């Protein structure tokens, strides 16, 4: 079933891997790939999603650099090493809900701009919480493996 | 008229004999035939139709009294028919539409012949989409140590069916229908089970062409064997000739005779019909007539489902 999720995990990672100029931000992402995947399946998806966005520190040019990453390949994530890493993982999760048609791409892209709609995004993900958590597993587990392999210490 | 034999589970029709632990430091192994010999199918119906008041030492004089006449066996998956096709030790289950251009194929130039033949047994061969060799391995345990005995291990390549498959035969008899129908039979092998099904089906009884398919082993009467093997190209276009045993009879627990045959799926020329008649003597014609009743000398036209015989 999820044979094309190891593919998706490779394009999503190669995007995050490049919009992480600072080396300490890659290492910080490798820390998110290991940890965040293991709270989604012990604490739940949206309890971990809330934790992700709260540490992501949205509402900046960052929140619009994400929108560019969906299509562009020259976008960059700037901010705290702990912020770019947590926000880069928010991309990873959202990049999947787009490419798999769980969340409409047009909704998500305009919900990432209109402040009034972000609450409706979190409200949509709450009802898609059981469905999402099942599908992303193979995808996130692959992202975890790619991180430990590709993100190396100098 | 037509009898469908539906295997409920992988079967094994082994040749080559001697599947039992005899030598101490050695395993045993057996393969399976893809198509059961007509002796197997005859013995199955003969098992249903059994009355003690008969025979006493015959197994075919006793068998031919029960069944009228059986015609050779092929495959039917989903209303499609597949027929055995044989080469220099290659066997294939090919579909009806591919036998038409065999006589023209076997006569083409060198390079065009090989390519056409090669693509029949590899690309157009529909055997392995229908039948898999399930290589079951068995073991005998001694209750003393509760482990395996001294090398009492055997490998038996069963006949696993990936799809729904029936073996197709035809019988001249029609009072036979409501007797062998819906019957659970012990279709010959390692105590396996198949189901029987009878429905009517209209096919030809006697035809004339220049190339036949052998839908059953064509028995060679062991007296023409010399005048036959020395010039084999005059009789067999392609296929396989070998010495086979006719089976194992139940009422006497003895292995049946062993005589050379032309294996099912071979392509026999018209020259094989008159040759047999003009070589078999009436001392044995009465015998080989029975061999045909149980279903051995069965020919098929490369045209269409028209079933001939040789002595009939």
């Amino acid at each position: 079933l999820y044979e094309e999720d190891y593919k998706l995990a490779l394009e999503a990672f190669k995007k995050v891997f490049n919009a992480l100029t600072h080396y300490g931000a890659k290492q910080a992402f490798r820390s998110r790939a290991r940890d965040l995947v293991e709270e989604i399946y012990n604490s739940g998806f949206i309890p971990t999603f809330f934790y992700i966005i709260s540490k992501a520190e949205l509402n900046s040019d960052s929140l619009d650099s994400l929108i560019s990453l969906f299509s562009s390949d020259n976008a960059i994530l700037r901010g705290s090493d702990e912020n770019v890493s947590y926000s880069a993982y928010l991309f990873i999760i959202l990049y999947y809900l787009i490419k798999r048609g769980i969340i409409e791409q047009k909704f998500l892209i305009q919900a990432l701009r209109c402040e009034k709609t972000r609450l409706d995004l979190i409200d949509k993900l709450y009802n898609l919480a059981p469905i999402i958590s099942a599908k992303i597993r193979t995808y996130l587990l692959a992202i975890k493996r790619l991180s430990e392999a590709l993100i190396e210490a100098r | 008229k037509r009898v469908l034999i539906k295997p409920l589970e992988p079967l094994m029709f082994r040749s080559q004999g001697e599947f039992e632990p005899l030598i101490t430091g050695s395993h045993t192994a057996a393969q399976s035939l893809i198509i059961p010999r007509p002796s197997t199918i005859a013995g199955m119906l003969g098992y249903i139709l059994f009355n003690k008041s008969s025979g006493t030492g015959d197994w075919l004089s006793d068998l031919t009294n029960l069944l009228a006449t059986i015609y050779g066996t092929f495959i039917e998956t989903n209303g499609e028919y597949l027929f055995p096709l044989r080469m220099g030790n290659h066997l294939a289950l090919v579909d009806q539409q591919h036998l038409i251009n065999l006589p023209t194929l076997l006569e083409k130039e060198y390079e065009r012949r090989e390519k056409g033949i090669y693509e029949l047994f590899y690309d157009k061969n529909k055997l392995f989409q229908i039948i898999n060799h399930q290589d079951r391995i068995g073991i005998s345990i001694d209750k003393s140590t509760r482990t395996v005995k001294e090398h009492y291990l055997y490998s038996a390549r069963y006949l696993a069916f990936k799809k729904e498959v029936n073996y197709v035969i035809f019988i001249d008899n029609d009072a036979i229908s409501d007797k062998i129908n819906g019957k659970i039979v012990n279709f010959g092998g390692e105590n396996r089970i198949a189901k029987l099904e009878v429905d009517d089906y209209k096919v030809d009884t006697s035809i004339e062409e220049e190339y036949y398919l052998a839908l059953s082993p064509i028995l060679i009467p062991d007296e023409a064997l010399d005048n036959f093997l020395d010039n084999i190209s005059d009789y067999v276009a392609m296929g396989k000739v070998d010495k086979i045993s006719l089976g194992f009879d139940i009422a006497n627990t003895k292995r049946k005779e062993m005589l050379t045959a032309i294996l099912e799926g071979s392509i026999v020329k018209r020259s094989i019909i008159d040759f047999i008649k003009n070589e078999i003597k009436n001392d044995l014609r009465y015998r080989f007539s029975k061999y045909e009743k149980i279903g051995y000398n069965t020919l098929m036209s490369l045209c269409k489902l028209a079933l001939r015989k040789i002595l009939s």
């Binding site: 099942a134 | 399930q134 079951r136 696993a160 019957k183």
Partner: protein
């Protein structure tokens, strides 16, 4: 007919099962289960008969000849047998389920495919002609399910959506509205498409690694690691016992088969990998 009667039964795994097959398949398993023509776990008729015959000779040592007449007489005497087992066919494998409130909540469910239910129907049709104790109350149920082939189905439960084995989201449809369930356990039975079911089923199969330890240094030996495959608890295999017409089989089917509730099949009994339960579909129907 010389198959006077047929006694189908369900093989219910009380503990995990391991009926071995050497090293016949690839995946990564060194000691895999016995497969069938299409990859599901089965119990071969040789292993199922030999295990029941090795059992039941210790259980009823006085009736050793009644069993020898029916089940083979393993000695050098070679009178023909009177009873035949068919290969045990995987009927339903347990699956972890997360349903979206969708129900009275369940944690696990039975999962079948349509391929598996065709072979069960094949076994069921084949013996209806001799079983004058016609179990059409069961054969019909498979017929209606097979009529609804081509979509995920829940027989008696009303879920409409669930997550099977933490990986597969499926939407379910009632049979038509309702029908009695086969397994009397208060557990739903799902029948999945053959593509989706083959993944959900392969996820219930237990594939463990096992270790041999150097007892002096408490570390694993070199090459002391291998892999095995077990069939979970609560799994259900369906098979039939065909009997020829005789007087020994009348005793065997009445005296011996009534008292078989638990037997031991397969191997690795030291790990407790063989305790299974037979249920004799003549009272559960």
């Amino acid at each position: 007919p010389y198959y006077a009667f047929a006694e189908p039964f369900f093989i219910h795994a009380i503990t995990h099962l391991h009926v071995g097959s050497g090293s016949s398949v690839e995946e990564e398993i060194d000691l895999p289960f016995q497969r069938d023509e299409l990859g599901y776990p089965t119990i071969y008729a040789s292993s199922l008969k030999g295990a029941i015959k090795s059992f039941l000779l210790k259980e009823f040592p006085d009736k050793r000849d009644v069993i020898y007449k029916v089940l083979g007489e393993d000695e050098n005497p070679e009178e023909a047998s009177l009873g035949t087992f068919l290969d045990a066919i995987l009927f339903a494998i347990p699956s972890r389920i997360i349903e979206i409130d969708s129900a009275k909540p369940y944690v696990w469910v039975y999962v079948t495919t349509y391929e598996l239910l065709k072979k069960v129907k094949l076994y069921l049709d084949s013996i209806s002609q001799l079983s004058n104790a016609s179990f059409s109350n069961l054969k019909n149920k498979i017929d209606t399910i097979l009529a609804k082939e081509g979509k995920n189905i829940t027989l008696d439960s009303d879920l409409k959506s669930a997550i099977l084995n933490e990986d597969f989201y499926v939407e379910l449809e009632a049979l038509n509205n309702k029908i009695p369930s086969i397994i009397n356990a208060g557990v739903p039975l799902l029948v999945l498409e053959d593509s989706i079911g083959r993944e959900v089923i392969n996820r219930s199969l237990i594939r463990v690694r096992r270790i041999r330890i150097d007892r002096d240094k408490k570390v694993v030996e070199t090459g002391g690691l291998w892999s095995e495959e077990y069939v979970p608890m609560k799994t259900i295999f369906f098979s039939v016992l065909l009997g020829k017409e005789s007087k020994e089989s009348a005793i065997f089917a009445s005296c011996i088969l009534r008292n078989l509730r638990y037997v031991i099949l397969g191997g690795k009994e030291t790990i407790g990998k063989g305790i299974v339960e037979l249920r004799w579909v003549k009272d559960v129907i």
